Coordinates of C-alpha atoms and ligand atoms in Angstrom, one line a residue:
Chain A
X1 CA -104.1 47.6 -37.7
X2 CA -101.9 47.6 -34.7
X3 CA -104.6 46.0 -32.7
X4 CA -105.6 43.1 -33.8
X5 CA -104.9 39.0 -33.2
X6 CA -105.7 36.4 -35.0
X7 CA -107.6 34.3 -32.3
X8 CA -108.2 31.4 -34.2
X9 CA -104.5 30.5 -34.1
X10 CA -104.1 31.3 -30.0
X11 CA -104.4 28.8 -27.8
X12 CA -107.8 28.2 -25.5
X13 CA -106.2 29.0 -23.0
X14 CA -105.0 32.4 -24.3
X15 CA -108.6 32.6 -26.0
X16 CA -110.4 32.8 -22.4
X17 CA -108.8 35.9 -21.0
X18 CA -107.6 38.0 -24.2
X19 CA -109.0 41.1 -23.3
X20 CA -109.3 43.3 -26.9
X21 CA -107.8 46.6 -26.9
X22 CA -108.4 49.7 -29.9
X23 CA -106.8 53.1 -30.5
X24 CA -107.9 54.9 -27.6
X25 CA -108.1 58.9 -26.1
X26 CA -104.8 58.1 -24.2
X27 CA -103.1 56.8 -27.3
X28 CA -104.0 59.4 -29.0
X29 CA -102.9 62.0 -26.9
X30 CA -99.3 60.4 -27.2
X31 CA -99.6 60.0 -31.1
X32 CA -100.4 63.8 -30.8
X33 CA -98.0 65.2 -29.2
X34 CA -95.1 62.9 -31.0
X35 CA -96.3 65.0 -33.8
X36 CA -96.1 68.5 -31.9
X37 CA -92.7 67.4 -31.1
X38 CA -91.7 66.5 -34.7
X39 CA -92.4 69.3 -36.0
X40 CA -90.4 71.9 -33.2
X41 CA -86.7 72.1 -36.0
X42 CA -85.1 73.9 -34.0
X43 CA -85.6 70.9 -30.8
X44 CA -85.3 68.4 -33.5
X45 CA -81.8 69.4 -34.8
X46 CA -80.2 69.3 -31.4
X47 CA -81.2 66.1 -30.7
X48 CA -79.7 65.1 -33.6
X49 CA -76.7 67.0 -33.0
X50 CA -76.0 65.6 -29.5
X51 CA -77.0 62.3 -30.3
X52 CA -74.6 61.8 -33.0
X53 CA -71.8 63.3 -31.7
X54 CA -72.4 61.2 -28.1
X55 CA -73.3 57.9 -30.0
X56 CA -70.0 56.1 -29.8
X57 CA -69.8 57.2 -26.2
X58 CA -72.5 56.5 -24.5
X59 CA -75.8 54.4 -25.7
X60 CA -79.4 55.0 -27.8
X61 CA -80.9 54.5 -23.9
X62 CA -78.7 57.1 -22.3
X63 CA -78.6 59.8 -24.9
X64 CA -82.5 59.0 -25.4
X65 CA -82.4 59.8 -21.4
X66 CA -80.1 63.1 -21.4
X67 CA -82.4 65.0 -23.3
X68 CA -85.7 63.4 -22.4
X69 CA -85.7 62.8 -25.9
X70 CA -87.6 59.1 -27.2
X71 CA -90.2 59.0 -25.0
X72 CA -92.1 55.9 -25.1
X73 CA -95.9 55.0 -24.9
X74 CA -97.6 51.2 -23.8
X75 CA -100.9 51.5 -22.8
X76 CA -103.0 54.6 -21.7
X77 CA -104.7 54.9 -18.1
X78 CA -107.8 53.3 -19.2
X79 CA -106.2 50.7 -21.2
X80 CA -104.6 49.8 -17.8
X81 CA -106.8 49.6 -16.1
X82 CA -109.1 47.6 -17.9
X83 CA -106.6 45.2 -18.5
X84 CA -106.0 45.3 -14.3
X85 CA -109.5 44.9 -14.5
X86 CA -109.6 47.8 -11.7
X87 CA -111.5 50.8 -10.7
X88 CA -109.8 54.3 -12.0
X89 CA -109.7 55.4 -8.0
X90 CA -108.3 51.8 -7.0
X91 CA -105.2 52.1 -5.0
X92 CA -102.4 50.1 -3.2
X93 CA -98.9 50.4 -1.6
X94 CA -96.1 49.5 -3.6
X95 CA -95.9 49.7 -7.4
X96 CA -92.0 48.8 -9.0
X97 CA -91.4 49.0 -12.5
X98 CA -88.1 46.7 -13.2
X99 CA -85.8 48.8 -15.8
X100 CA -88.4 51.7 -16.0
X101 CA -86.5 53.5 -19.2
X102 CA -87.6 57.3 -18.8
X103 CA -90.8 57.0 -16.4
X104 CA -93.4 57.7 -18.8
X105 CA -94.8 54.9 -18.8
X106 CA -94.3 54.3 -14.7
X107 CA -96.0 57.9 -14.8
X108 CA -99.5 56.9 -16.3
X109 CA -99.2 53.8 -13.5
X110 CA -98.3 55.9 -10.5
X111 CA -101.8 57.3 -9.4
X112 CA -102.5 53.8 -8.7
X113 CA -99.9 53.5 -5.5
X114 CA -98.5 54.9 -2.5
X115 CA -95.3 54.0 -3.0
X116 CA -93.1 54.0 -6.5
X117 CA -89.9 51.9 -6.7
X118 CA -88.1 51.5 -10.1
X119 CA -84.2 50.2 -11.1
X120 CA -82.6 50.9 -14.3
X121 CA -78.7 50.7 -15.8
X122 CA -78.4 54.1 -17.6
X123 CA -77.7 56.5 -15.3
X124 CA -79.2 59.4 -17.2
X125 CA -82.5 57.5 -17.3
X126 CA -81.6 56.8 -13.2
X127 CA -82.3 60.7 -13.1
X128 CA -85.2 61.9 -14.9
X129 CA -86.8 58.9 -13.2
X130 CA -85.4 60.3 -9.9
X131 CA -86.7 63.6 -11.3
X132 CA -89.9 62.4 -11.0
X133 CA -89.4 61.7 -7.2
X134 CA -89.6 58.0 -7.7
X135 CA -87.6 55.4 -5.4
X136 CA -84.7 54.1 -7.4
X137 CA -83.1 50.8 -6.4
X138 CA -79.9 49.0 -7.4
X139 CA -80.1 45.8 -10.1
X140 CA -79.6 43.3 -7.4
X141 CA -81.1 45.4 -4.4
X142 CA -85.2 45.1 -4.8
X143 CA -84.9 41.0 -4.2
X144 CA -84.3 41.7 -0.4
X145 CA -93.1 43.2 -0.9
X146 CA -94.3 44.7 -3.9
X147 CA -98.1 44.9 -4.0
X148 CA -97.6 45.4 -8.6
X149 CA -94.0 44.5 -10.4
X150 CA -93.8 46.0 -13.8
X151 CA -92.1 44.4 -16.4
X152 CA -92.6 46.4 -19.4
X153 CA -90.2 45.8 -22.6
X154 CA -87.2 44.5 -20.2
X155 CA -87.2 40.4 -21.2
X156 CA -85.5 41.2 -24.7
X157 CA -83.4 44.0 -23.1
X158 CA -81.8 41.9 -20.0
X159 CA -78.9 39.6 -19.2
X160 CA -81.3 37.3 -16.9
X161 CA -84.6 36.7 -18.0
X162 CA -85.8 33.8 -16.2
X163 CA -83.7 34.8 -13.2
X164 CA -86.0 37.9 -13.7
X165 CA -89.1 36.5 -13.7
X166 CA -88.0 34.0 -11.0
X167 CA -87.1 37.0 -8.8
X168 CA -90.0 39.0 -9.8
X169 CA -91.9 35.9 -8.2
X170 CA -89.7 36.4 -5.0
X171 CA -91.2 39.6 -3.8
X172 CA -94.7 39.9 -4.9
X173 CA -97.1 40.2 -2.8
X174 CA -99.4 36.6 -3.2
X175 CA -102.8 37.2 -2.3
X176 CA -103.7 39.8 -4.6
X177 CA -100.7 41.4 -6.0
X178 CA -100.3 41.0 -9.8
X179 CA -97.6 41.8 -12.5
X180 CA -97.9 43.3 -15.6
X181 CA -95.5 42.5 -18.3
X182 CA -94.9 44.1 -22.0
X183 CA -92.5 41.9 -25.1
X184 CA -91.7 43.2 -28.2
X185 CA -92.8 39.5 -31.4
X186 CA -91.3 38.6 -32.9
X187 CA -88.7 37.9 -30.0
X188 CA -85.1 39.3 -30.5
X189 CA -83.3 39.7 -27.8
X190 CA -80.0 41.5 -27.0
X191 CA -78.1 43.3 -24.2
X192 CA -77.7 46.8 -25.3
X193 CA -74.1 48.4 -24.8
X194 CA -72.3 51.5 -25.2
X195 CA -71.6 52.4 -28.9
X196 CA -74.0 50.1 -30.7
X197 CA -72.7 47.5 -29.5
X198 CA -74.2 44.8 -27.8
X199 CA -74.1 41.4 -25.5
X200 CA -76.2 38.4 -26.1
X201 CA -78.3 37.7 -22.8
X202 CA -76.8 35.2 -20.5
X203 CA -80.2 32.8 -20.4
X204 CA -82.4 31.8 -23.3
X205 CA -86.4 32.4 -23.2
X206 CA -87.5 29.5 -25.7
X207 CA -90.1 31.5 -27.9
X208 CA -91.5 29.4 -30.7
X209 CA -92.3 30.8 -33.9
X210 CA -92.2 33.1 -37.0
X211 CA -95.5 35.7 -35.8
X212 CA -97.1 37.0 -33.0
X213 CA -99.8 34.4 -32.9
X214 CA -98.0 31.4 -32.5
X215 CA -95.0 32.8 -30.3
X216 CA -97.7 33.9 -27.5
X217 CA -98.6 30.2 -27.5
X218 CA -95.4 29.4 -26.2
X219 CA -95.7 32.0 -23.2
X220 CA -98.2 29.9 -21.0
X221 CA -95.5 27.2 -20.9
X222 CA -92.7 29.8 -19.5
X223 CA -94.5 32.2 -17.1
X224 CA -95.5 28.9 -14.6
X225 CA -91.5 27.6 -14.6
X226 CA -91.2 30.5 -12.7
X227 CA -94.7 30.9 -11.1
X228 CA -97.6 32.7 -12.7
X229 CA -100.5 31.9 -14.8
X230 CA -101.8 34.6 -17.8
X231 CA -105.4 36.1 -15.9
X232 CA -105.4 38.8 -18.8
X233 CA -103.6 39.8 -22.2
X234 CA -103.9 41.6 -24.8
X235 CA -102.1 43.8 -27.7
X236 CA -100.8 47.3 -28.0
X237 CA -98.7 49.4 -30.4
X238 CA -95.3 50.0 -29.0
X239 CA -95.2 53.8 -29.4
X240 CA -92.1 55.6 -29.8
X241 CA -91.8 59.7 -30.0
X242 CA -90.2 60.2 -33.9
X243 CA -87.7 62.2 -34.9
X244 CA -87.7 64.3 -38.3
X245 CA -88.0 61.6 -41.0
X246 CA -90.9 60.2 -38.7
X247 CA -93.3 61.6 -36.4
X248 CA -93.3 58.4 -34.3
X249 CA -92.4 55.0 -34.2
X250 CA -94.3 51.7 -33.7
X251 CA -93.6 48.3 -32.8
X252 CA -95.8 45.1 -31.8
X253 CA -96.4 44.7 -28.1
X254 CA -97.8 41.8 -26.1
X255 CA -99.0 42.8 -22.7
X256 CA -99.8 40.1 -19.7
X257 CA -101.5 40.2 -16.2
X258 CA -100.2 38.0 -13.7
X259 CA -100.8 36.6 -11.1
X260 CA -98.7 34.3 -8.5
X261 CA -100.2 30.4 -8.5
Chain B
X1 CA -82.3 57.1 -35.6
X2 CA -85.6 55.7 -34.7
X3 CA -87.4 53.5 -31.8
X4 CA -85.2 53.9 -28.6
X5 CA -86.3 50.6 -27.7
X6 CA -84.9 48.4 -30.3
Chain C
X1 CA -39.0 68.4 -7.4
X2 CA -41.1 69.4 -4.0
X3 CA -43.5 66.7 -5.4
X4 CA -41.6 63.6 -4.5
X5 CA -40.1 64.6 -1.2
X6 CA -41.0 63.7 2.1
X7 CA -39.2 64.4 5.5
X8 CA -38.2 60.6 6.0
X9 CA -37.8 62.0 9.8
X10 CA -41.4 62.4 10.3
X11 CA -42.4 58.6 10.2
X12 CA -42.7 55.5 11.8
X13 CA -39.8 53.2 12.2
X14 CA -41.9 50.6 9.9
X15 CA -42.2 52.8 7.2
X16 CA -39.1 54.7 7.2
X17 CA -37.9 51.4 6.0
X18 CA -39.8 50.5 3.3
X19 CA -40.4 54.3 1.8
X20 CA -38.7 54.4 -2.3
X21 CA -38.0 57.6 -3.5
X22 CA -39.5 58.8 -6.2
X23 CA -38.7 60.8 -9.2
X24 CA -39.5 63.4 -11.8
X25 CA -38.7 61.2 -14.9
X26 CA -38.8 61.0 -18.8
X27 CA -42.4 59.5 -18.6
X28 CA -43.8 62.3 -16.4
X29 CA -42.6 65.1 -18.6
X30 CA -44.5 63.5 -21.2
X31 CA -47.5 63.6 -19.8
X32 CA -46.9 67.7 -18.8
X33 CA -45.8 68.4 -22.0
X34 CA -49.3 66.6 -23.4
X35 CA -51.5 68.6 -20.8
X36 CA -49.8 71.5 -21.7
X37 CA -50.5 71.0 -25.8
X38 CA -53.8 70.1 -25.0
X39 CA -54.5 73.2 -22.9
X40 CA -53.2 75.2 -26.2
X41 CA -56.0 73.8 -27.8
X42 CA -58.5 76.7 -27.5
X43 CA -61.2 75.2 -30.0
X44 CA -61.4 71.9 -27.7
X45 CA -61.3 73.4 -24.4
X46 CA -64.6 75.5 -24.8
X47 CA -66.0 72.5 -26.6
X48 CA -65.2 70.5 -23.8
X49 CA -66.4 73.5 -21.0
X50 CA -69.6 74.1 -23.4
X51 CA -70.1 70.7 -23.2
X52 CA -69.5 70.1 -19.5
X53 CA -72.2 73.2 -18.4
X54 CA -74.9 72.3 -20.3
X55 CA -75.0 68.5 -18.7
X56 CA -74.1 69.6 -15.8
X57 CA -77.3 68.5 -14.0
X58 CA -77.8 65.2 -15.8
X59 CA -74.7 63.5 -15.4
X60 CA -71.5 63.3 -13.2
X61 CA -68.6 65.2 -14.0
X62 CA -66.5 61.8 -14.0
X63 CA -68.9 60.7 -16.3
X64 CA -68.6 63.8 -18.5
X65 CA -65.2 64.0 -18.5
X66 CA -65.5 60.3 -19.7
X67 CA -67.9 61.1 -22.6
X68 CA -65.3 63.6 -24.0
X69 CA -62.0 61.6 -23.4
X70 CA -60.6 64.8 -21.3
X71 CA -59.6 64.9 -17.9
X72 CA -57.3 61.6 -18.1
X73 CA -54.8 61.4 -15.4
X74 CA -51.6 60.3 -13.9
X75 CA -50.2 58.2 -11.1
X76 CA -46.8 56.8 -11.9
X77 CA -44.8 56.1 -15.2
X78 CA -44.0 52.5 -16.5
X79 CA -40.4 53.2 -14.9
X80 CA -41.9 54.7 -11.5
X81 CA -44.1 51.6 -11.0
X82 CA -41.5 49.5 -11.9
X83 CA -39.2 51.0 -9.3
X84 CA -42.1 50.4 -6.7
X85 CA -43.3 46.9 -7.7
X86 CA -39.7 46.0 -8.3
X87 CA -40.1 44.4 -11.5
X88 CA -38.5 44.4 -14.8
X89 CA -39.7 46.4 -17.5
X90 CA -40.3 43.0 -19.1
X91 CA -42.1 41.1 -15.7
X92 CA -45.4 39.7 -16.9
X93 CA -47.7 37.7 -14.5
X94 CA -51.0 36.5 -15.3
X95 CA -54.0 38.6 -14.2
X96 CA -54.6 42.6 -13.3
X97 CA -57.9 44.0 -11.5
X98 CA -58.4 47.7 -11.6
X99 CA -61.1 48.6 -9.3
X100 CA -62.2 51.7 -10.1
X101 CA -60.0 52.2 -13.5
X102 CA -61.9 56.1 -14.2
X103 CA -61.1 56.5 -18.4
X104 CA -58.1 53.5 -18.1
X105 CA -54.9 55.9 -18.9
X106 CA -53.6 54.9 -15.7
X107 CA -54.4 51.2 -16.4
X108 CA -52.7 52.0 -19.4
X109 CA -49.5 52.2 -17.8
X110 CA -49.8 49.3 -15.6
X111 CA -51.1 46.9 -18.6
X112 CA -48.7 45.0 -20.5
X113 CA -47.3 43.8 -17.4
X114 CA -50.6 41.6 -17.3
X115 CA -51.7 39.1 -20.3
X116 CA -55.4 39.8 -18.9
X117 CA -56.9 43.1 -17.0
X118 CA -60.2 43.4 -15.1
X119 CA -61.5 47.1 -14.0
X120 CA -64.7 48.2 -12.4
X121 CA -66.3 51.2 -12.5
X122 CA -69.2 52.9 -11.6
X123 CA -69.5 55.3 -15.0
X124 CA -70.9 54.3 -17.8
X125 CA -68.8 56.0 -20.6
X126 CA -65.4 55.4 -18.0
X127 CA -66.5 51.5 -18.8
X128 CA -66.9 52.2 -22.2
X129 CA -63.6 53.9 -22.2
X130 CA -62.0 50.9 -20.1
X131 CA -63.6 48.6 -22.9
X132 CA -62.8 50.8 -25.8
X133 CA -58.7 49.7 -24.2
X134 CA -59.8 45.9 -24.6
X135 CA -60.7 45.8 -20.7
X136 CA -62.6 43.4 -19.3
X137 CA -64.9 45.4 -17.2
X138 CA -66.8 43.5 -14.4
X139 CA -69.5 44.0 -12.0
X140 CA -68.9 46.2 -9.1
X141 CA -69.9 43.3 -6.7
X142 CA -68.8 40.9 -9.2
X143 CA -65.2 40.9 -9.1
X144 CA -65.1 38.9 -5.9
X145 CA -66.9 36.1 -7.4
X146 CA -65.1 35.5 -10.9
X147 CA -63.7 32.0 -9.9
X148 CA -60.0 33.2 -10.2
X149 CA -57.5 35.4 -8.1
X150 CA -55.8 38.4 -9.5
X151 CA -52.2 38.4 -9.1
X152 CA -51.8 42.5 -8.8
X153 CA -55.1 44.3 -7.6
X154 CA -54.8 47.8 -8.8
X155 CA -56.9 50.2 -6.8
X156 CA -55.6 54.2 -7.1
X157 CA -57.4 57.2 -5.8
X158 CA -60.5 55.2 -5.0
X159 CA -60.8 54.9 -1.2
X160 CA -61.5 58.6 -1.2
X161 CA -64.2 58.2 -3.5
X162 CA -66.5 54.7 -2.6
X163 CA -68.6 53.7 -0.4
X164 CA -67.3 50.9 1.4
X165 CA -63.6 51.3 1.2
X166 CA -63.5 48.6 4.4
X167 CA -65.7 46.2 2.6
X168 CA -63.4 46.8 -0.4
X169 CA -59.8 46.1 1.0
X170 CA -61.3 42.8 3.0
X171 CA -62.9 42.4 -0.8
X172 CA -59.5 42.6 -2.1
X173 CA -57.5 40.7 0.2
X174 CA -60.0 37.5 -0.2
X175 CA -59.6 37.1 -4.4
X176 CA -55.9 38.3 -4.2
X177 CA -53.0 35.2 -5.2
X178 CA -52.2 34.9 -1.7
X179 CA -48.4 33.7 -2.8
X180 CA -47.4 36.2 -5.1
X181 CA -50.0 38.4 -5.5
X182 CA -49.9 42.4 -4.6
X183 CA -51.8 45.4 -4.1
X184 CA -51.4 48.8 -5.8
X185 CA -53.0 51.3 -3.4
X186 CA -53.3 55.3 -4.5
X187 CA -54.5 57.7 -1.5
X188 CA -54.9 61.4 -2.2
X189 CA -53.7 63.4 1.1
X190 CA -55.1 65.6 3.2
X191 CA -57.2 62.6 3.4
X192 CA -60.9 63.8 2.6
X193 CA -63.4 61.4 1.2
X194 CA -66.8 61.9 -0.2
X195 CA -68.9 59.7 -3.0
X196 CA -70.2 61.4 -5.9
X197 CA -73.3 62.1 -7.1
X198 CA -74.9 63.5 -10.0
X199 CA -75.2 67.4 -10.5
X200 CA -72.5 68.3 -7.8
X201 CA -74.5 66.5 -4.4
X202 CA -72.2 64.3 -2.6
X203 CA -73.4 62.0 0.0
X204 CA -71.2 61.0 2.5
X205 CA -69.6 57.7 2.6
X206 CA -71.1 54.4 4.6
X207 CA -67.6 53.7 6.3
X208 CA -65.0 55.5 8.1
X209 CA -61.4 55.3 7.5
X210 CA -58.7 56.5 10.5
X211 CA -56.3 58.4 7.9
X212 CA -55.7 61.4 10.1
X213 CA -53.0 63.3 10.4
X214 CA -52.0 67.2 9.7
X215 CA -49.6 67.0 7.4
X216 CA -48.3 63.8 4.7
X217 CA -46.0 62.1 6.9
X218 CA -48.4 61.6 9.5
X219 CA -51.1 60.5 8.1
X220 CA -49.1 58.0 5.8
X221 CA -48.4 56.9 9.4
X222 CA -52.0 55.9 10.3
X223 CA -52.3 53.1 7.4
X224 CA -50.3 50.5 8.3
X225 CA -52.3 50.4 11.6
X226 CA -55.7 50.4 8.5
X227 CA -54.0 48.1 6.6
X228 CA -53.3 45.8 9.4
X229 CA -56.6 45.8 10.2
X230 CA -58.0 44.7 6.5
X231 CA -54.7 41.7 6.3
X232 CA -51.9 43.4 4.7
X233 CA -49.0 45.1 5.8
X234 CA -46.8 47.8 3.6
X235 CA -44.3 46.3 1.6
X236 CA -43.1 49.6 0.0
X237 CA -44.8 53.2 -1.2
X238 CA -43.8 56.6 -1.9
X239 CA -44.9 60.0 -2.9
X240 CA -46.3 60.5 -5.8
X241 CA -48.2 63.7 -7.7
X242 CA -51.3 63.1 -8.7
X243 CA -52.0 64.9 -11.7
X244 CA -54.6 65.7 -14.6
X245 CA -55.1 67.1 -17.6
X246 CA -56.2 70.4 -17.8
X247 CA -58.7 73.0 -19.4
X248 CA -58.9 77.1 -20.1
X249 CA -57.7 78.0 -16.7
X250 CA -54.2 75.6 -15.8
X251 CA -51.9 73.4 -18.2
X252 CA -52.6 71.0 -15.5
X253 CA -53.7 70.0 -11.7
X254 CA -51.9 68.3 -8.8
X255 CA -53.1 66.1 -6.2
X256 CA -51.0 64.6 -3.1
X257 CA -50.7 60.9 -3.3
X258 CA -49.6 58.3 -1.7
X259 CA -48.8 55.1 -3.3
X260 CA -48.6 52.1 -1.7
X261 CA -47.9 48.1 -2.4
X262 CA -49.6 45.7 0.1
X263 CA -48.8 42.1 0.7
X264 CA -51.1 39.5 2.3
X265 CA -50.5 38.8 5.9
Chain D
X1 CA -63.1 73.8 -13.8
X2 CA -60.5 71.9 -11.1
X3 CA -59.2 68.4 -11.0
X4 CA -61.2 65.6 -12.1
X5 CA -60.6 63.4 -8.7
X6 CA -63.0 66.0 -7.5
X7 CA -64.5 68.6 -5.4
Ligands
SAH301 N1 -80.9 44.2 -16.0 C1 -81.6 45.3 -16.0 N2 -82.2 45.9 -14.9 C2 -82.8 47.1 -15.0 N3 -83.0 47.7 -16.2 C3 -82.4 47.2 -17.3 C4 -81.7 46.0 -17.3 N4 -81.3 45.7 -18.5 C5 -81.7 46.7 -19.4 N5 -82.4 47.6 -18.6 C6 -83.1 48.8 -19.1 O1 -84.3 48.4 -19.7 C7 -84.7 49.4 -20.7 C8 -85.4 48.7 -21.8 S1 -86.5 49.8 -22.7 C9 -87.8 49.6 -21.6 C10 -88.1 50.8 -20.7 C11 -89.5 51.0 -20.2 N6 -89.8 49.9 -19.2 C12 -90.5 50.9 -21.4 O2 -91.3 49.9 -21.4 O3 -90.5 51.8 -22.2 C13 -83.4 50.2 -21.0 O4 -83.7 51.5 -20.7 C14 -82.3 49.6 -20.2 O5 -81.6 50.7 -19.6
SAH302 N1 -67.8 52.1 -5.5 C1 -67.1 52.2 -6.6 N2 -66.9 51.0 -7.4 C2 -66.2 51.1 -8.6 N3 -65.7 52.3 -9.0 C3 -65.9 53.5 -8.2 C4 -66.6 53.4 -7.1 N4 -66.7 54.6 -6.5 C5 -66.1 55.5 -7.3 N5 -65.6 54.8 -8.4 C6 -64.8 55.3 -9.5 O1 -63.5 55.5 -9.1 C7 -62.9 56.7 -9.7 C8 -62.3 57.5 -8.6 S1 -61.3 58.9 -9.3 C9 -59.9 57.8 -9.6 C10 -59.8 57.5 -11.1 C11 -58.6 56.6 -11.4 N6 -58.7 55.3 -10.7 C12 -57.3 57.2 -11.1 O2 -56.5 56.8 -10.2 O3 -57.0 58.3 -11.7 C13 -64.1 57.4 -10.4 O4 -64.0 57.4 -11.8 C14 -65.3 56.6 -10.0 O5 -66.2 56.4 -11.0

């Protein structure tokens, strides 16, 4: 199952606020409609064709982003906000989610805030997130108050991790504000680039282990040298819309509520 | 093809 | 040709004496005789208009000229800079920084005069274009804070097309090799800026420059008083065409430039 | 189409 951790292997401290999450309607939904979609041939085949022919010129991320193709799923309204621990009419002013891919998953977020601010590098994920009327920012231009920072999948993806999360702690609101955070375990990190290609990141996030038990152990030790403390966690598939040798694709998640200490 | 995250 | 020639009469006694005439030479024919072929090449050209319709919205047409490897362009030959830089064809210095190098066959030209070349640019599949050349593409804002000057600063047909093209030439002037170092500075003319957007908008640009004039000669005349004012003064220029590949419609397109070279003051 | 400085 995609859902469950062993506990005995987590740490106590891990142990006290791992909330337990299941297959729910919203996941569902997604899982659904990745098959609808995988099934349309004639949509199928032009995604393949334009991907294939674009891939040494542009990146996965980008062509993924010019046909709203890849869409990607982490945790269904419920699911947040039971991991928020909030009410489903809660509400405050500024959400941002940091490297936002396509704005799915800022969409099943946004009817939690006034305001929606999001930054990303490809710039035809820059536009269907624009599409969706949110507030895009520059890499370096939201560290000029943000009442929720998202962080969703962007640690193993980034150039700057613990700059990141040392910046993320820069603008967040303190009394109540809290971040949520998403990392594909085991940890493998690279800096995507045009063609297949990629960097390695500039920083190194020390993540002990060989499985998803022990290498959560070693988050508690990272998230205070920058400035938060785990108030809830849990596990979720990393849902990926399929193509048509798969109706969808998974991959282990790890998602974390923060809060500033 | 596959996941367009990894 | 009526691309290279200016009435010298029409300007100022500072730049009448540092104009250099210009020429339609071996290395420009080459390049028409490329567009030209190219243009011939029915199957590609409605590829690359096919292409260029349906993504219209999505991306930028710099960008999508980029993805296909069309629309590559032309400032100078290696003999034409040369003659303007006054340097051998075998003068070699140490460090190059394109700023805003588009698809890098204009760096192209300008390279092995270099043993390392730096470009920015704002395109993603330019940049991968500029790497794809062995470029060593930096951060827009990054440039300035490499840890090294660059001994020519190369920065054609781009102060028509940023943001802060003040902020830029003070940018420029403050990591340029203040002994020997030079700028390379393209202006298209009637001077008429704008920065691009995606799907056709164009917002307007966050700094105004004084090139004003109504016709070449004059307002080549109102730089040195801009380049004054940003720490250079304009050790020689010319005219130049500015031209580009074409598609279904022309073998090719022509711009007015103005090429400069800058030293420090 | 035009020239790819723009319009
Ligand atoms: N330094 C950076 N700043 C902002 N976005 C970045 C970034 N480095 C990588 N990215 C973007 O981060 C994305 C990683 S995939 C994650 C997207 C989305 N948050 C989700 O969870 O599905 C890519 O789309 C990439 O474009
Ligand atoms: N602010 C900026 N920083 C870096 N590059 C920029 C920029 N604004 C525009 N550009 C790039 O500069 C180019 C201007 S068109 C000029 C292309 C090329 N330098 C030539 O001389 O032919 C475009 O490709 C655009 O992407």
């Amino acid at each position: 199952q995609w859902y469950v951790c062993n506990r005995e292997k987590l740490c106590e401290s891990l142990q006290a606020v791992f909330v337990q999450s299941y297959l729910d309607q919203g996941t569902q939904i997604f899982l659904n409609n990745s098959i609808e979609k995988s099934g349309w041939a004639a949509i199928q085949a032009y995604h393949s064709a334009v991907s294939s022919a674009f891939s040494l010129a542009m990146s996965r991320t980008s062509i993924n982003g010019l046909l709203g193709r890849g869409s990607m799923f982490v945790f269904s309204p419920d699911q947040f906000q039971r991991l928020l621990k909030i009410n489903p009419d809660w509400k405050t002013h500024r959400l941002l989610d940091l490297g936002a891919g396509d704005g799915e998953v800022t969409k099943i977020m946004s009817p939690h805030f006034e305001e929606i601010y999001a930054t990303e590098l490809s710039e035809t994920m820059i536009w269907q997130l624009q599409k969706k009327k949110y507030r895009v920012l520059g890499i370096n231009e939201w560290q000029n108050q943000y009442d929720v920072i998202s962080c969703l999948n962007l640690l193993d993806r980034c150039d700057q991790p613990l700059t990141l999360l040392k910046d993320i702690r820069s603008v967040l609101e303190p009394t109540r504000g809290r971040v949520i955070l998403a990392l594909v375990l085991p940890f493998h990190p690279y800096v995507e680039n045009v063609g297949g290609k990629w960097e390695k990141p500039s920083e190194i996030l020390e993540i002990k282990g060989q499985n998803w038990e022990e290498q959560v152990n070693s988050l508690p030790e990272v998230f205070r040298k920058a400035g938060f403390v785990i108030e809830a966690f849990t596990r979720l598939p990393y849902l990926c819309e399929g193509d048509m040798y798969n109706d969808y694709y998974v991959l282990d998640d790890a998602v974390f509520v923060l809060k500033p200490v | 093809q596959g996941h367009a995250h990894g």
